[PDB]
Amino acid sequence: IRIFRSELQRLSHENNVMLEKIKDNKEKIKNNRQLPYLVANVVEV
Amino acid sequence: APSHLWDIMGDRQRLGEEHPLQVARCTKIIKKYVINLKQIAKFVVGLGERVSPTDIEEGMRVGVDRSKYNIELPLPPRIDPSVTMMTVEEKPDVTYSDVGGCKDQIEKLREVVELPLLSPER
């Protein structure tokens, strides 16, 4: 009984630790985005 | 003689990396500004350092830097035509009293043209 409830509480704690790593990756994406995008025509998908 | 006084600023107004600006026109404004070059090339940039957000208008020539494109100074639009620059004259030799006669055809032109310009409140 306590084992089932302990794995669900620790699951959200592990996601919160990985959430800070994703936020750091989002900052890297924002840093990798620079104002000029120029222009490109997409002729095929 | 006048060139010597302007050579002092030559260490700034010349060697600076700002002045080499690329002139272009902003096609789309998002409030990201889509700007089309003269080489048939476009890009998207933001404001500058001293650039005000209300100075940039739709369909206006906007100069940007040559290396890394960024808005620096706005420019008046319609820069292509060179023909109408010579159409404006200055100080015509014919005066107002050169037209001979007291004929009332003179009084009709001054009231519809000269009067609203000199006395707009009449």
Curated annotation (Swiss-Prot), chain A:
<comment type="function">
    <text>The 26S proteasome is involved in the ATP-dependent degradation of ubiquitinated proteins. The regulatory (or ATPase) complex confers ATP dependency and substrate specificity to the 26S complex.</text>
</comment>
<protein>
    <recommendedName>
        <fullName>26S proteasome regulatory subunit 6A</fullName>
    </recommendedName>
</protein>
<comment type="similarity">
    <text>Belongs to the AAA ATPase family.</text>
</comment>
UniProtKB/Swiss-Prot annotation, chain B:
<feature type="modified residue" description="Phosphoserine">
    <location>
        <position position="52"/>
    </location>
</feature>
<protein>
    <recommendedName>
        <fullName>26S proteasome regulatory subunit 7 homolog</fullName>
    </recommendedName>
</protein>
<comment type="similarity">
    <text>Belongs to the AAA ATPase family.</text>
</comment>
<feature type="modified residue" description="Phosphoserine">
    <location>
        <position position="119"/>
    </location>
</feature>
<comment type="subunit">
    <text>Interacts with UBR1 and CIC1.</text>
</comment>
<comment type="function">
    <text>The 26S proteasome is involved in the ATP-dependent degradation of ubiquitinated proteins. The regulatory (or ATPase) complex confers ATP dependency and substrate specificity to the 26S complex.</text>
</comment>
